[PDB]
Design a protein around this nucleic acid. Structure first.
Lengths: 305, 208, 186, 133, 146, 97
RNA sequence: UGCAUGGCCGUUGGUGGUGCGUGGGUUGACCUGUCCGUUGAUUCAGCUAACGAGCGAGAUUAUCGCCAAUUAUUUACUUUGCCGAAGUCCUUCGGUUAAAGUUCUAAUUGGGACUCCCUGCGUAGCAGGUGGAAGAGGGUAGCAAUAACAGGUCCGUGA
């Protein structure tokens, strides 16, 4: 069902590229184009939802992507600067930078179990670092790489699956174990492949330039279903708990119910010859309570079902 | 035992005297500049010219007239001086060389049209983007009057003049009056040849 | 930001701008942002036209009183003189200086002037309070030159009579010539 | 806990240095009462009047003349207070707002520097004086 | 607000420079430290200066100032002090230049101070001795109480 | 062993940056441990017209002096090999301390 | 002898200008190309017997301003620790191949600003505003077309 405006809150002057939330609740971090990445903390008390907790001043360009420990201690973040930065959560202060990656770095994730840092950008390689900070594996691809995501859980032994979405069109999926052998490679999108996320269970995967959100299979490949968005969508992210999938267009956020197989809702809040704000990222909380979305003027808006 | 300033300036002042010297000796051999390598005890110099055979004739006597003239001037020790020669590939595009060809003609009473369009054709066919030739002074009349002969295209402004445009000024004394010769020659950039980078005017878009 | 007072003495709580009159007050520049502990500042006020409004008004006087050719620069001199006016103003009358100051800035600058026959144009409020501060400070140095008397006093003599609308003042005499010339030419 | 940041007008450069302490602010080797002016006393304290009883600041300077050396210190005090609250965020953004409400020079500084001298004239833009006839 | 120190009592750095230097001038006239020279008394402080000093006890207020300025720069030379106490040259039709002070007046003091042991000579300029910088923090607590 | 300084000087920066690369490169091979000085603008400001005619116009001729200092501990055997770049308008003073 | 000349420089004018290939117009000098808004600008936009290549403008070079990587304990400093002198319970000085560095200092490689963003006005662009170290060529210089002046210099020259 549809959901009302809970709270806008702002502390961030340029746009927001990405956004992520630490485990359970409290503490979300909005990576910002300003080159400064905040962390908040959530009161959820009437008028103010959150207030800002730290600022991470260190990079010399926009901060692309931001990724978090299971503890919510030792978060990592990357920029076009061509480096990454581990930042102690409590005292800020960079712990160690990363050096090796040539061009602007667009995508970061951890594993589930704090094992392998997965940086990626426009040198056409997914680097796999150690948590120590030294380069283990150097996987390869045709074009630039916008986005990555990691399969949940796996209990250590299971291969930890890495979906990737490219600038040319293609969508790579990889195993790890040790050597990292790609399960499948496919021409997932017609032109540009913007953003990639997993289904929580991880049978399926999500990618989608040509106004088409397409789910695919984790093993081996080929499509389950193809939807059609109204106008071209920048970020995609499935709900944790319930069977939803959601997609940040210009016109709103297109809320597919996956079984019923249709857009139930489209939520933009109200505000000649101007663009007016796009939404460039989504973030479901870990409970599936609340939906945060980061915006192009420099704001974040919360909605709760 | 010098300052850090003076070792630069002495070496500069060495080079400019050396280069004005080898205008006046190597007019016949066809001079095209030089490079000087300076060491506290060893000096190595590359002379560059067209007629490399004209040195080596008479079992290399012509170079040993020059080498003593350098040695006695600055009072350097032999063994510690080490001259070579290295040949000019493409004499067409070096400016000091092609100046001398236009100097060679106008002494021997060729018309100035024919003298320019000798060398201006020879420059362009050899491999260059443009060239200009000026012959300033007194032919025919009592007043002096300027010829300018140009082809191709010839960039006159900015930084990009200094990188691309070779040029060379001179003069011919005569029975009647003092003419001035002047030859500007623009180059094409090579891919890492012997300039590297293209002009800041041009850009190139890739094919899809 | 609770006291907030000039030279560490006077306060801006007073000065009743609404009370002073209608119009004129706006280009006055005594509205909160303008208040500062010391009138000295790193000015960036000559960049784009109307930015002179957003600076403090007491500073704008201290700049006018910077002439001629020997006193150029040396602002740090001028803000002593305007201090030692604002002692003489306050401790003689018992009004505080800033109230009786801004009344002087009202009534000096003439409405109208001969635009080069000659025709009598009206004025902007910006050009009034400009030609307030000139015709005060012009009179001060013209008086103080050769006069065996300190210019802090000769400012304070000019500045009191500007408020009370007397023809003692070099300001308020010189407007009634300039305003009558506009009335004559017309 | 300690933070080390600079101010800068014209060609002054004043570094300041926060610690934990007991409300001591010290220029060169001495309290910032002692600048001997009565204008420029009140100019350095504009940062502090708006807003440090935890903090202990220790300021050293070079460059500039008498005025611009003060305007570096107003930057170095105010920035070092703001840089302390940033490291050691809610309250930093609102106390920083009180300065930027007052005046922009306490954090930002100004990039203007003197124009080089040009030939044919005694300074930059002035030129000597013509004759004619 | 005002600058606040630790350390309870007062030191030579703390109290103000116009005040301190004159209290240290008085502290020689009572004690018979320094003395006046007897040859001098009519001499210009510097050749550039247009007249003798006004004060007649001027010798001591200079001799206080040099000990104050040995304190604040640790070392103090003669030629360094001579350059300091000079000024611009005022009279002539040309533009004005920095000329130096007299040496002899300043030398006379820095020998007279080394009689009562208030300044040793060392490497680089002269630097004040354990006896010396004690005498300043006598006068700092004299004028700190005041 | 007599910890030795190089001191590398040049007119032109591209010609310098070859020699710094080589003399840093060779301390990789020999394995000797390896430890920018401020550049001078020699401004000479001649009046550009020959005669006294015309408006007084002045060309400014900056010669530039880029200056770098590598230094390292090295045993006289190893240092003879490293010293021997040979570039146009570059100098290298060796200095024992 | 600069009114016999070379080079170099000032100036007309550092303004926005200059003129080729093929085509067309004219008996011809010659014209067209090189013409209702915009820009510092023959700058772009679009008209259109012209279409297409130039040169100058722009780009580029140099520096000033803001960034953080890369180095520096005998050529810059800072912090902490030691040993001094005073204070005399913790404050300030001076020294130190002694441990960690880089905010000041020094200088190389890159990042950064584009009318991108919003609102008015009229596609080219313009005015204001937010943010920003910096906003409208970011500031200041350097370089600077063709065509000439009987302007200057035979007292700069082994012109």
């Amino acid at each position: 069902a549809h959901f009302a405006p809970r709270a806008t809150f702002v502390g961030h002057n340029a746009a927001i590229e990405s956004i992520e939330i630490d485990n359970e609740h409290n503490y979300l971090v909005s990576a910002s184009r300003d080159k400064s990445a905040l962390v908040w903390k959530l009161n959820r008390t009437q008028e103010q939802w959150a207030t800002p907790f730290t600022r991470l001043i260190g990079h010399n360009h926009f901060v692309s992507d931001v990724s978090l420990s299971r503890d919510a201690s030792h978060l990592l973040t990357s920029s076009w600067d061509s480096t990454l930065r581990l930042w102690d959560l409590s005292t800020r202060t960079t712990k160690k930078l990363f050096l090796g990656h040539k061009k602007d770095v667009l995508g970061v994730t951890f594993s589930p179990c704090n094992r392998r840092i997965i940086s990626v950008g426009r040198d056409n390689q997914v680097k796999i670092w150690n948590i120590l900070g030294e380069n283990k594996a150097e996987l390869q691809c045709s074009s630039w790489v916008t986005s990555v995501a990691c399969a949940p859980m796996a209990d250590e032994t299971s291969p930890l699956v890495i979906a990737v979405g490219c600038w040319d069109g293609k969508v790579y999926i990889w195993s790890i174990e040790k050597e990292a052998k790609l399960i499948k490679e496919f021409k997932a999108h017609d032109g540009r492949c913007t953003s990639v996320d997993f289904t929580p269970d991880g049978k399926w995967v999500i990618t989608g330039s040509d106004r088409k959100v397409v789910m695919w299979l984790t093993e081996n490949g080929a499509k389950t279903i193809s939807f059609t968005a109204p106008s071209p969508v920048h970020a995609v992210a499935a709900c944790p708990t319930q069977a939803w999938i959601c997609a940040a267009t210009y016109e709103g956020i297109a809320v597919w119910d996956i079984g019923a197989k249709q857009q139930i809702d489209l939520v933009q809040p109200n505000f000649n010859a101007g663009r007016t704000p796009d939404c460039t990222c989504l973030a479901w909380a870990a409970d599936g309570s609340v939906l945060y979305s980061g915006y192009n003027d420099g704001s974040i808006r919360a909605w709760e079902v | 035992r010098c300052t850090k300033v003076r070792r630069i300036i002495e070496t500069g002042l060495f080079y400019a005297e050396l280069n004005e010297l080898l205008t006046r000796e190597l007019t016949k051999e066809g001079y095209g500049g030089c490079e000087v390598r300076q060491t506290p005890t060893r000096t190595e110099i590359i002379i560059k010219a067209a007629n490399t055979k004209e040195f080596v004739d008479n079992h290399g006597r012509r170079l040993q007239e020059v080498r003593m003239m350098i040695q006695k001037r600055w009072r350097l020790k032999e063994d510690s001086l080490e001259i070579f020669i290295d040949r000019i590939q493409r004499k067409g595009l070096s400016a000091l060389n092609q100046l001398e060809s236009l100097r060679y003609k106008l002494i021997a009473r060729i018309p100035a049209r024919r003298a320019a369009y000798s060398i201006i054709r020879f420059v362009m066919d050899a491999g260059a983007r443009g060239c200009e030739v000026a012959i300033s002074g007194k032919l025919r009349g009592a007043r002096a009057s300027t010829s300018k002969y140009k082809e191709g295209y010839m960039v006159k402004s900015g930084d990009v003049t200094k990188q691309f445009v070779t040029q060379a000024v001179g003069h011919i004394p005569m029975k009647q009056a003092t003419i001035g010769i002047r030859v500007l020659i623009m180059l094409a950039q090579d891919p890492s040849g012997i300039p590297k980078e293209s002009q800041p005017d041009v850009i190139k878009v890739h094919e899809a | 930001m609770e006291g907030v007072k000039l030279f560490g003495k006077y306060d801006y709580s007073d000065v009743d701008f609404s009370q002073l009159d209608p119009a004129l007050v706006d280009y006055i520049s005594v509205h909160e942002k303008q208040h500062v502990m010391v009138p000295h500042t790193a000015g960036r006020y000559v960049h784009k036209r109307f930015q002179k409004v957003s600076c403090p008004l007491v500073e704008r006087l201290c700049n006018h009183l910077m002439s001629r050719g020997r006193n150029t620069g040396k602002k740090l001199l001028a803000i002593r003189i305007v201090e030692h006016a604002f002692d003489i103003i306050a401790l003689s009358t018992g009004q505080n200086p800033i109230v009786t100051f801004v009344k002087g800035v009202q009534y000096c600058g003439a409405r109208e002037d001969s635009t080069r026959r000659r025709q009598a144009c009206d004025v902007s409020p910006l050009r009034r309070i400009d030609q307030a501060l000139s015709l005060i400070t012009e009179g001060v140095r013209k008086a103080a030159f050769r006069s065996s008397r300190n210019i802090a006093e000769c400012l304070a003599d000019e500045l009191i009579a500007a408020s009370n609308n007397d023809q003692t003042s070099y300001a308020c005499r010189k407007k009634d010539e300039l305003e009558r010339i506009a009335k004559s030419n017309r | 806990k300690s933070v080390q940041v600079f101010g800068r007008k014209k060609t002054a450069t004043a570094v300041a240095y926060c610690c934990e302490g007991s409300g001591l602010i010290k220029l060169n080797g001495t309290p910032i009462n002692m600048v001997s002016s009565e204008t420029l006393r009140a100019k350095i304290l504009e940062p502090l009047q708006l807003i440090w009883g935890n903090l202990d600041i220790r300021v050293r300077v070079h460059g500039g003349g008498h005025v611009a050396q003060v305007y570096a210190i107003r930057q170095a005090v105010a920035k070092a207070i703001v840089a302390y609250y940033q490291k050691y965020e809610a309250t930093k953004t609102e106390i920083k707002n009180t300065l930027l409400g007052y005046d922009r020079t306490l954090l930002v500084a100004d990039p203007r520097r003197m124009e080089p001298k040009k030939f044919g004239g005694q300074g930059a833009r002035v030129r000597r004086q013509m004759s004619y006839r | 607000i005002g600058g606040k120190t630790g350390h309870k009592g007062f030191q030579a750095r703390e109290i103000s420079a116009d005040v301190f230097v004159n209290a240290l001038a008085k502290h020689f006239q009572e004690n018979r430290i320094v003395k006046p020279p007897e040859w001098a008394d009519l001499v210009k402080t510097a050749a550039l200066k247009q007249m003798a000093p006004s004060n007649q006890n001027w010798f001591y207020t200079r001799a206080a100032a040099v000990i104050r300025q040995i304190y604040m720069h640790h070392d103090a030379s003669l030629s360094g002090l001579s350059f300091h106490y000079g000024a611009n040259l005022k009279a002539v039709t040309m533009p004005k230049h920095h000329h130096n002070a007299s040496r002899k007046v300043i030398r006379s003091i820095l020998q007279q101070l080394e009689k009562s042991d208030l300044v040793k000579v060392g490497e680089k300029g002269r630097q004040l001795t354990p006896k010396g910088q004690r005498l300043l923090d006598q006068v700092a607590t004299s004028c700190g109480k005041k | 062993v007599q910890k030795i300084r190089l001191t590398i000087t040049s007119s032109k920066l591209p010609n310098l940056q070859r020699v710094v690369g080589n003399l840093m490169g060779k301390l990789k091979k020999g394995n000797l441990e390896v430890r920018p000085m401020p550049r001078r603008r020699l401004r000479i400001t001649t009046r550009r017209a020959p005669c006294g005619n015309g408006t007084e116009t002045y060309d400014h001729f900056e010669l530039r002096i880029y200056k770098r200092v590598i230094d390292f501990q090295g045993t006289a055997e190893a240092v003879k090999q490293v010293t021997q770049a040979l570039e146009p308008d570059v100098h290298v003073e060796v200095s024992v301390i």
